[PDB]
Design a protein around this nucleic acid. Structure first.
Length: 246
RNA sequence: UAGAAGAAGUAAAUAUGUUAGGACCCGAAAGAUGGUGAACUAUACUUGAACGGAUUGAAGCCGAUGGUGGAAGAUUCACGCAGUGUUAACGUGCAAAUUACUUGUCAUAUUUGAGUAUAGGGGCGAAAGACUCAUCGAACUAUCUAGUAGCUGGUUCCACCUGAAUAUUCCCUUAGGAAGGUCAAAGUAUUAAUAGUAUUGAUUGGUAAAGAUAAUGAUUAGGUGU
RNA sequence: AUAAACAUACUUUGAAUCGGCCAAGUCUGGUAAGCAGGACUGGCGAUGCGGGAUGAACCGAACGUCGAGAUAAAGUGCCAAA
RNA sequence: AAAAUGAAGACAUUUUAACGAGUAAGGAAACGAAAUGGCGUAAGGACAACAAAAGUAGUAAAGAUUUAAAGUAAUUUAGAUUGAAACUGUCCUUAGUGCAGAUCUUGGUGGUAGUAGCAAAUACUAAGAAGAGGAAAAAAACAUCUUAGAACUGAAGAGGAGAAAGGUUCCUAAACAACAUUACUUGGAUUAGGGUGAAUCGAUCCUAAAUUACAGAUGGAAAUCCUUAAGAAAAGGAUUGAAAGGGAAUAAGAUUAAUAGUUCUUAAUCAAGAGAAAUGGUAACAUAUCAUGAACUUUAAAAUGGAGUGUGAAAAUCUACGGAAGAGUUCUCUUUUCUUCUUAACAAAAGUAAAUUCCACUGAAAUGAAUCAAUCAGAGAAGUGGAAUUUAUUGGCUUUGUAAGAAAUUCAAUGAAUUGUGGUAUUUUUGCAGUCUUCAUAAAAAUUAAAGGGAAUCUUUUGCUCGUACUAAUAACCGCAACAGGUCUCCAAGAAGCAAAAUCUUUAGUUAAAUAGAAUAACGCAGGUAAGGGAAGUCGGCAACAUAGCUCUGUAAGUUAGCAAGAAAGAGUAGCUCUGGUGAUCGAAUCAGAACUUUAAAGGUUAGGGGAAUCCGACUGUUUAAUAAAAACAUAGCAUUCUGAUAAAUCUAAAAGGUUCAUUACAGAAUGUGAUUUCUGCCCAGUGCUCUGAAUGUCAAGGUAAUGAAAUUUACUUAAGCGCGGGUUAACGGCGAAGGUAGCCAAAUGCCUCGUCAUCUAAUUAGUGACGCGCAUGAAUGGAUCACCGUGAUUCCCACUGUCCCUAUCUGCAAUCUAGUGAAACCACAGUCAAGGGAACGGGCUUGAUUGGAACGGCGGGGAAAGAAGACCCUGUUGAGCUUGACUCUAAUUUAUCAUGUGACACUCAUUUCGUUAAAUGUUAAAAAACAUUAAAAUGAAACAGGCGAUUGAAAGAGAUAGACGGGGAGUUUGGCUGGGGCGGCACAUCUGUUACAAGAUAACGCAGGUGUCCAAAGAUGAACUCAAUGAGGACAGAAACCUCAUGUAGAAUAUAAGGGUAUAAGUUCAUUUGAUUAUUGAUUCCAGUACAAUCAAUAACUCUGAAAUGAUGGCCUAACGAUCCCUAAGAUUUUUAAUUAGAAAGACAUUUCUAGUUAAUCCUUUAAUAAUAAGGCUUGGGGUGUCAGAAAAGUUACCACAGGGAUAACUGGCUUGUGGCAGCCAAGCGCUCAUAGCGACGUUGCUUUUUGAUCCUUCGAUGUCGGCUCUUCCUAUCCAUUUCAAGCAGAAUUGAAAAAAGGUAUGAUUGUUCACCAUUUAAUAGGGAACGUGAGCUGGGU
RNA sequence: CGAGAGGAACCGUUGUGUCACGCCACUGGAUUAUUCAAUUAUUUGAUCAAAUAGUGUUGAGAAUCUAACACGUGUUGAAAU
RNA sequence: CUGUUGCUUAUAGACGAUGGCAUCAGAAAUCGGUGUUGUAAGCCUCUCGGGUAUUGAAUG
């Protein structure tokens, strides 16, 4: 047989990211002394639209802690941020929307975003539109805190992991019904090559494991093991349940 | 049941037969290995170029239902492009896919140049096994390679002599082989080593015929007795 | 009884072949077949010649090149010898 | 063959006799009485004038062509002509040694054949010139150049230029052999020269997508990875990447045969060089350099989508006023029609704009301001007065310098004349202003300017390298070419119109672009028309007709309320003469109305046919380049699955490797259904998937222990997986684990079927609406529903028409003929028929009919015409694509063990994943979008740690081994016989009776059956007895219970199929027993005289039975079964050796033999010798191959391929004729009586090839496979008309039959249909054949 | 003929349809005599006269060709069956 | 005698062929007759005008 489209996607030739007009990498500033033991102030100069992502990006300008000059940053904008606003990053930062604090300084029940998974790694979790994580509980015995990920899973992180207080702006993006195939075509302008998806049943046996015969049907169960080799792992993998749940 | 029983072998040049090699000559679809191709086409990115005229009339806005407004992967015409029909022309063509008319489409899922990226059990595919330089249900090129072929075709001077076969056994055997029969050529033996014939003599067989209150089986009728 | 010395017995080595088909005072399956399959023999294949007008197999008869004669199958109105 | 003769004769001896066909095949050479005889080609060794010049040859070699002779023939010999330098004869040796074929290879050449053709692109004509080249009884045509006429492309061009590509094709002169389908004096062709000029245009420079280095990482290798991360490399990161992106700076005129933002004239511009730091204005801000401004930092520019509206300016077009100059028309007018009236870069600043944004004064409500639209205002409107910027260079337009001295248009013969002013018009270009739109927000760098800071104190020179010619296409490019194909752009006049549409014209280009003339046949290709009828044609309205612009009136059901809609339907439209409406302080085409006239008006060109239903897909979109444009794909919507990022998916041999990911669940990855509305029923048994679970059901390498001298052996313990249990069907799936729910239906789904009933028509296999036990509908395999949409499928109306009744006719180009030029396919030889036979459909053969030689135009009957080693079918022990618990494996994934960090879980120290400019680690001491740096001062600014800061962690990754899983992938296989193959069967190993023919052998998918077993007795033996059945008797007892006598040839039994055999037995009963054993021979059956297997006859043991003779090496006989290799069992003491006692005889200064006693070892080998284990040998059995002389083996190809086959199927033909059809004989009866007017049962005899079978003879290097249309001919078994006879014939209408095939035999609805069935009409509407007539005749509905 | 109901035939006359052969008088069709006239667009300064739109279009339209659309002939005799 | 040739020949015709004439031949205009259209151009009237008319029509 041939190689399925899922296999051809891993070589990354026409499936590379269309990341030419992107603003840059959106993350916190590199952790230094002035943010471990003090606070720095950053000015929100502008709010921009990063191609390929649904949330706006903020161009924050911190002055400098040690040398003369500027430190131009690029944050993921929290909902409620405005141009000309002063935001603060540091351990002693106040509990306001848009500030970046260590996760241990946030009281239980605080709503944060752009949380770090590992301290000093400049943000991992809760970065898509309208997404956030909630602080569940703290643990000073081992300097760890528990947060609730946007998928509902609970994660235990170091208490000095950093996060920004508030909601990621742009919520409700997916609640608007795409109506035209053209609109879906433009949605992937600054994304990968994935959109027009040919069903496996509509292919031939060489192209896909679903490539059927005289009637368009799969023919074998669509739930497969995780240990299935690439090229046969088509359908639902390690499906605990299946069907319209009740 | 091999051997011995006053040794017969060996060498080399030919012919014939068997065998292996390109193997009497030409013939596959295939397989593998190493390279070359995205000047055609498929998709994607970078940077450029290309919307003239009508129809219709959504929000929003003004007035006392009338205006305004100009939206829409809205309707159409043109420049272009395609290829629905004629199953027209042509069909040793203008053309290894074109021409004419009719038809459709004719800017946002649009059209298009150049640059660039993806390569053969691979790529790319709005999916037809489509396209990947007139080559694709696995490109092109060179080597292994004069691949193998129980199958098809051909196989070159004269006179003379002899002259067949379609049984039997075994086979993954049924378009083919080996044992064997028929045939030829060489080489012997004085040779208990002649007969596709008849006669006489002693046999063998169960066919044609014959039989059917002779055994087995089938079958029409008539007397006589109980 | 008859025949048989270029009789008889062979030995070695080897070729080709084992798709067969036809006839009938024969047989089986079949309604039957220029059908399928057999027993014995003669043929065609491998074979020309004379005759059946023509014909692989019928009939006569098998072949070095010729001359003269008697013939075979079968023929004798003409084509066509009688 | 036999005799005779035989050293050399000669003809391979003499005589005699017999004999002589031949495919496949054989007969090598030598062999005196020759074990076949010879011819030819080339080369090698010899021989070739015997007396010391020794084969032939310039007194003519080889070769070629013919003429004769010899030979049965292969061939040889000689002559003549041609040819001029080598060659030949004989014997041996050697071979790249003899051609008619191979779709053979290479080359050359015919017929076709002077044939098909040189027919798209509207078109040429007259005079003259040049030239060999328009002659001539018209030889009707004549290439190039000029002029005149007539025309075409029609400014989205057949115009003027570029990019790529080409490469000298550019220009000129000479010259025309070849080339451009005639010709050429022409040419993109031949020859020779000439031609491309840059500081300002480009390349060069910058970066984009991307690309490539050193060091490093990875790999067995080649090499791969990394591109700033890994580095003592590069203030921060290397190379390349655009002649369309970014970019310092040049214009006008003239000039050349050709180059020109490049040369010349004039006039410019740019870059790089040389000669205690200013004012003005309230402010926005402004001042021919002025008026300093370093490190460092910041900002801006370069530099950013699209739509639509309004508007400023320029240009073009049009037009008003005033002319100057020239040209056109002019006996008819026209103060007329036409042409020119221009001006650059770079700068200046008389006069004067539009738009936007800011500044000052004042403070708006009775709210105002304004736009086409909007939009705006106390974080301040309007007003007044100002500042700035944009408007194709300075500063937008006029104007000015350049600069009229140029150029344009004229006039004279170089010299003179002119070169105003406007427009509330259209289009293009270029800006601007706000509006809208995105789940799209629509480059970077080189490089430039400014700011914050306050460190320090006009003239002139040069401007390098490379490209620059020409085409850019109906002839310069890519397609074999001067190919009707394809190939990216720039500029862009008039009329008319909504229009860049069609049509015509101007500037420019061209009249040549594969030759023409005459004629005016058929048949064509392209374009038309048509009486009356109007789809009756046809599979089907295919094709054609028809509708068509604009204005007004009007517009239905349905509907997702948006549409349907240009629904449908109706009226108007011309010309001329007028009037009115729409503005500014003269002008725009637009609208409305009114008279009158006519050929009554959109129609030259352009320019929708409409309606009523059904099916499918929701829609816009995409698709099989070259037979499928769709109902297929996509789509949005819906739904499911996994994943916390060190992850999921996934590329890679590996990798500080790669992709989604510059990402983070509103995300990434994998899927199904396919808008909306309504609804998604029941099932967890099976296969998947999953579990937060199961221990001692089964599980590997390992680890532990025991024995042994050790290998070995044994026991125990070990993971995932499988098994058990729970969940899951918008998982695969099923719906009598649960029995099809809601719905839907003869459906694109229903065989029967042309289902039944309505309706549509005169007529309905079609359509629609109902019905539903539905072969075989049904719910995200999605069920039902359908508004709008569709180059989708289907049916019916109206309208229209050559589709048709039924054809006629007109035009152009061909075809015809001619001049010039000039192919190809195909070709065994060829070319009149009938019948026969033949390979069963002859051009050739046999017999007849018949024939005059050469051919022109047509034509499609034949040449089973050409094209292609059939693609359908079958066979190969031939493949390939795809599938799957087919067989055997494999990547990926997964689990267990091993691989040594410390301290007793804790730590870090290898290891993992990260982050930064390795930038304060560890221990001590939310008012404000502003600035923040190069320090004063006398250290400021704290010390130390052996950790750059975190995270993970002795776990995990990679390696090795072991188990699981693994069509993701690799390799391969997928029996045979066979009235084609498959399905079936086994005729595959096997036994009996029969076919089967009285020896043996012996066929069919012939007939009736059987085997893969059964038996410690059913084997062996001895003895006794007689069986089945019947008759007659005996309590219950009877037709059958048991007893007795008699008869009883087997009619019983004998394991079984059948056939044989058997009576003091081979059957029954009783008794003993294990011969159903070991060893050695020789035969018979099958047979190749192989094996296995079976059948015997003997011999040596040891036994059994019997008194004994005997009998017994399985079964009463004929079936009841199995090689090599491998595994596994049993057997090899009968005897031979050695050592030491006792005795004896031979043996050179030891040692063997014989005899008895003893003790030990003993089937052979593991090769230096032994030992105990282990293994290997030898003989004989078992384990088994049933395809039974014995591979280890699933499908599907309609995507298919190859070698072949008429050894073999699908069509014709041929034999047959069961079946189909037709016709007879007899006569029981029917026919009121009456066998025969008309019938005719029970039987029986034929004919036909118009049915379907049966067969496999021809065709597999191909005979185009249904029907219809068209057209001819033939048969008669006659439907009509003509002539007759009979009747249960009164007439009429009919019925049966004879002569007779010369003439007729129809139109339609449904269906592809042949057929069928209906509605008509007719004198009748008969049946059939001709390769199931007829495809280089059509059509393509069926297949 | 027949009870009736119904119900013929020969001779003679007159037509029609089809097939065959023709034919252009009458009637109809085609029409590039681009014949004559009208008219749309473009270009000839205007009139006239034209040309172009490959036959611009329309009305009438001779000739020639032709009708299934016009119209003639094949009603024709002897002998043997 | 026949053929060629001429009448850009017809009663014929793809080309041949066939038919006619060939110096009293043929061709040509012009005129008359005969048709078609519809009333020309210059100034409703001139005007039943003008135009065409064998090309495959009929006289002279």
């Amino acid at each position: 047989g041939r190689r399925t489209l899922s296999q051809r996607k891993g070589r990354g030739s026409i499936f590379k990211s269309r990341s030419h007009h992107k603003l840059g990498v959106a993350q916190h500033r590199a952790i230094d002394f002035f943010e471990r033991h003090s606070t720095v102030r950053g000015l929100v100069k502008s709010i921009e639209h990063d191609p390929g992502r649904g949330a706006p990006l903020a161009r924050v300008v911190f002055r400098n802690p040690r040398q003369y000059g500027l430190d131009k940053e690029l944050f993921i904008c929290a909902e409620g941020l405005y141009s000309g606003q002063y935001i603060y990053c540091g351990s002693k930062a106040s509990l306001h929307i848009g500030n970046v604090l260590p996760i241990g300084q946030c009281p239980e029940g605080t709503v944060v975003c752009n949380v770090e998974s590992k301290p000093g790694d400049r943000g991992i979790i809760a970065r898509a539109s309208g997404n956030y994580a909630t602080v569940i509980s703290h643990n000073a015995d081992n300097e760890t805190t528990r947060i609730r990920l946007p998928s509902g899973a609970k994660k235990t992180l170091k208490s000095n992991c950093r996060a920004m207080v508030g909601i990621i702006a742009g919520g409700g993006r997916t609640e608007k019904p795409i109506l035209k195939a053209g609109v879906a075509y433009r949605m992937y302008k600054a994304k990968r090559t994935t959109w027009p998806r040919v069903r496996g049943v509509a292919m031939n046996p060489v192209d896909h494991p679903h490539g059927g015969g005289n009637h368009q049907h799969v023919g074998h169960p669509t739930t497969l093991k995780r240990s299935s080799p690439p090229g046969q792992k088509a359908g639902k993998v390690a499906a605990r349940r299946t069907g319209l749940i009740r």
